[PDB]
Structures are given as C-alpha cells and as structure tokens.
Amino acid sequence: GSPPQCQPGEFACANSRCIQERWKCDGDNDCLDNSDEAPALCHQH
C-alpha cells in the first residue's frame, strides 16, 4: 500500500526498471515496456 519504486515515490516499469515519477503520465513508452502509459498506471495520450 506504499510503493517506493526507485526512491520513496517513483516508477516501477514491468520491463524491470526503476525510473522517476515524471514518466508516469508523460505519454512516452519511456519504460520501453510502456507500463505507465498503459492505464493500469496512467496513460497520457
């Protein structure tokens, strides 16, 4: 119920990646697996 994901408030990519919360609703694949930009997380379009 408290996901850190890289630092205490970031993004975990299903490719297997810690990157930063910018990428969440940024609208690029960014993750390369496009985790954030599938609406399991957000998807800016």
Ligand SMILES: [Ca+2]
């Ligand atoms: Ca993104």
